[PDB]
Write a protein that binds this ligand. Sequence first.
Ligand code: MG
Ligand code: MG
Ligand code: MG
Ligand code: MG
Ligand code: MG
Ligand code: MG
Ligand code: MG
Ligand code: MG
Ligand code: MG
Ligand code: MG
Ligand code: MG
Ligand code: MG
Ligand code: MG
Ligand code: MG
Ligand code: MG
Ligand code: MG
Ligand code: MG
Ligand code: MG
Ligand code: MG
Lengths: 188, 156, 65, 60
Amino acid sequence: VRKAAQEPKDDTLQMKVRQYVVSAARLPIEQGTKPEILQMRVFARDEVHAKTKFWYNMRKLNKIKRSQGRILSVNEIYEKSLNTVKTYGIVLKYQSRTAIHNMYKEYRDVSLNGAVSQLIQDMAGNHRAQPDTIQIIRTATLEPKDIKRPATLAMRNAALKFPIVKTIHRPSEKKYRTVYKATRPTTF
Amino acid sequence: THSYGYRRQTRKKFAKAYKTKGHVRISRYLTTYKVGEYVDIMVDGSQHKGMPYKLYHGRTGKVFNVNPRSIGVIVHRIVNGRYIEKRLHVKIEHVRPSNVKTALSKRYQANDQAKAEGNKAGKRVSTKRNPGQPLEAVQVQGAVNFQHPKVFREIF
Amino acid sequence: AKSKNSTNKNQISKSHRNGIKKPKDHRHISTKGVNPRFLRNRRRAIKNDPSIKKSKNLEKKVNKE
Amino acid sequence: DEKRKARKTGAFYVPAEAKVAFAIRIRGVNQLHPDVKRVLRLFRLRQLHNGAFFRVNKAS
RNA sequence: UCUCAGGAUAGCAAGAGCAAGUACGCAGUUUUAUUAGGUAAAGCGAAUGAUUAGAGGACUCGGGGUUCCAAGAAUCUCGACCUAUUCUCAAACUUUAAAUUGGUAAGAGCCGCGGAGUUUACUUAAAUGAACUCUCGGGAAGAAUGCAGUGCUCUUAGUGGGCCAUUUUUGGUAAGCAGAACUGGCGAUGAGGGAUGAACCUAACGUUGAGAUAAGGCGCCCAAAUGCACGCUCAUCAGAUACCACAAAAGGUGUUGGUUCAUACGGACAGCAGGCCUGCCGAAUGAACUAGCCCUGAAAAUGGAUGGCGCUGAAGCGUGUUGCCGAUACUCAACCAUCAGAGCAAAUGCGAGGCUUUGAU
Ligand SMILES: [Mg+2]
Ligand SMILES: [Mg+2]
Ligand SMILES: [Mg+2]
Ligand SMILES: [Mg+2]
Ligand SMILES: [Mg+2]
Ligand SMILES: [Mg+2]
Ligand SMILES: [Mg+2]
Ligand SMILES: [Mg+2]
Ligand SMILES: [Mg+2]
Ligand SMILES: [Mg+2]
Ligand SMILES: [Mg+2]
Ligand SMILES: [Mg+2]
Ligand SMILES: [Mg+2]
Ligand SMILES: [Mg+2]
Ligand SMILES: [Mg+2]
Ligand SMILES: [Mg+2]
Ligand SMILES: [Mg+2]
Ligand SMILES: [Mg+2]
Ligand SMILES: [Mg+2]
C-alpha cells in the first residue's frame, strides 16, 4: 500500500496505476561519450513493475537485454489539473485466447492515470483481458474535434440531467446499521 | 540398451571432425610430456591402438607414468556415490596438453613480480581477484532515443 | 508375474546421502603403470645417493662400492 | 544535489548500485531440489521467515 | 543365482570406536580460469535418403508420334544431362549448432630452461636429458558464500512386489493400461485449505497461552465485508473457476466492445411517394470482420447434488481497492525432553552413570 500523490483520498475509487518514464543506456558505459539513451513511457503500479514493463518492451523493440544495459532513471509523471474533465484516447494491444489485437478506447476522467485504470477494469470485464498482456501504444488527451466514441460524445451538453430514479438505502456510518427496521424505506 | 561393447554408442563421438579425414597431425607426435603435467584426453578415430574407453574422452587427467608410445594418466570416476581412481594409459595420438596449469603459472609469475616490487615500496600488493562488482555512480550526457511500443501487424 | 525392470529412481539420492567420498591425496603414490626401466633407475640412483639417508649396513654396502 | 545538477542539464546521474541486500525466506522446507536447498543453506536461510544480509556479487 | 512369492551381494540404517577433526580444509552453491559434447533448433539453390512445380539449354543421350518430300531434312512428344529455380520432409540424415549440463583447476606439497648431487644395459654425439636430494631468487595467504553434516575403523538389523505428481518421454485408437529419465512425494505422515477423499495447495508435529499469517476464504450452514469501486451477463436447459469429473466440428439480426472499408442538410439509410432520378420526412445510416458473456449443437436408466440452502442493484463471469477470518508453519514467553556451550578442590550448602547454568532442537 504505497499511494502516488495524485491518487484520491479514498483508495477505493481508482486503480494503483501510475505513469512512469524510464530511461537507460547500453551497458559498456564509455565515459566522455554521448550515449544513446533509450527512454520509454510505461504504466505500472511500481517502480519495479515499471522496470519490467520497460525491459519487456525494450527487448521486443531492440537488441537489448538487462545484463546488457543499465537503468539511468525512473521518473513518475503527473497530470496537470485535477479540476477539469478530459476525454482521453488510448491505443492498445492485448492478447485474447485466439490472437493479438489493437484497440482504440476513450474515457472521460480527471487523470490519464484514471483513464488507464478505467481502461484496465473495462478490458477485464468486457474483454477478459489480462493486465500483464496489455500494451498501451500511445495516449492522447483529446481535443473535442478529435473525440470519436459515442459514449464519450454522449456527455457533451450543459442541459444534462439525471433524475435519480432509484435510491438504494445506504446508512451513513456503520454506527447506524440495522438488519431490520420498523418501517419501509422509499426510493425518492 | 541390449549390447555393451567397448565402442557401443561411439558413432558421432569418435567420427573424425569435418574435413579431418586422414589428418596425421605431426604436432601431437612432437609434444613433450612430463610426469607431473596435466593432460586433456581426446580420441581420434584413425588411430585404433591405445584407444581409451569413450567415457574418458574430453576428461582431464594428471600424468603419472611416461611410456615410449604412451602417457599414463590418472582420472577419477564416480561410482555408487564414491570416487574411484583409474590409471589410464593413452597412446600419444589421443592425448593433448591442458592449458589449466599454463594459465596458472603465467598468472602466478606476473603476480609474484608485482608483489615483490610492492614489497620494495612498502605497499602490500594483493593478487586476490574480485568478481563482477556493483557499478559505480555515473553521470550521463547523451542523445535521447524515445521508443513507443509498436502496433501489431501480420506479415504473410 | 510382472515386475519393474530397471528404475534408477532412489539411487542417486542414496548416493548423495553421506556425501561423495573422495580418496586422500597422498604425497607418495603407488608404482602401478610405471615401467621397470625407469623403476630400476630410481632404485639405483637412490642406492648411490649419499644425500639420501640409508640404513646402517646399507651405507656399509654403498661406501664399499 | 547530483540529481539536481543532472535534472537541470537534461542529463542524468546514476547513484552507485546497492552493495548490500537482504533476503527473507518465503517458502517452506518440504519438497525442494537438493541444489536449491543447499543454495538456501549458503545464504543461511534455513527456515521460514529468515532474513539475512548478503553482498551483491556475480557470485552471490 | 532351475533364478521371477526366495537367497546371497553391494547401496540405504544403527551402535561402539580410531585420528592432529593439515581448515593453505570441505561443498548436490556460485564465481573465475582452462575444456569437453552433437541433443533442441535449424538446414537440405550442402553431403545421405526421400520428393512435388513450371522454363530454358550453343553443346547432349535415346524413344515416339508430325510433316514433307523423301530416309533425309524440317518438326510436335517423352524422359535422361546440365542451365537458373521451386513444393514438403527424416529417430535409425547432416554442414551449422544452443539452453540445461560433464572433466580439471583457482599457490607454501607455489613459481623460475640459476646452482651442487645421485643413477653398476635409464636417455642423448653430448653434464645432453629425465627422476629424486640439499641449495639460490621471488611469493599478505592469492574469488564470493557457508560450515550447530572432519575423515576413517569395527559389528550388525531391515530392505531386495513399489506407487504418485510436474516436466520429458516409448508401445498403444485408448485406459484409473504397459514401459523409461531428473527432482519430489506417497508408502513410513499428521495439521489447515481443494465440501469429500494416499501422493494437489500451505505447510512438517514435544505439553501450553498470546500475536500476526500462508493456502484458502469473509450472504447463511461457517471464523471474517450482504465492504467500497469498475467493466460484462437474463438462460421455458444461466453461471459459479487449478489438479477435478469431461465436451467438439457447427450455428444465433441476444447483448457489449473492438477492426477494416463506406453514407449524410451539394439531405443519406428505410418507408411512403411520384415521375435512374425526384418530393415528403429528418440526424445520423451502410457493409464485411473479430472476441466477450448469453442462446442452440448437448440422449440413460433408484431421487439429487456450483458441498447444501439459496442467490439476478448478485451470493454470476474478468478486474480495482481496502480491511478482517484463518494451520500443528512464523513471533514471544512458560514447562518437558533431546543435542551442543560454559563453570564447579589445599574444596564442600550435600550423589561425577553428579551439581550450576546457556543456546539450539
Ligand atoms: Mg565430434
Ligand atoms: Mg554414499
Ligand atoms: Mg505374500
Ligand atoms: Mg547386507
Ligand atoms: Mg554414532
Ligand atoms: Mg576460508
Ligand atoms: Mg549441479
Ligand atoms: Mg565446443
Ligand atoms: Mg517450465
Ligand atoms: Mg505406469
Ligand atoms: Mg522437474
Ligand atoms: Mg518439485
Ligand atoms: Mg509396505
Ligand atoms: Mg505430507
Ligand atoms: Mg493459537
Ligand atoms: Mg452489494
Ligand atoms: Mg442446485
Ligand atoms: Mg451447474
Ligand atoms: Mg464451494
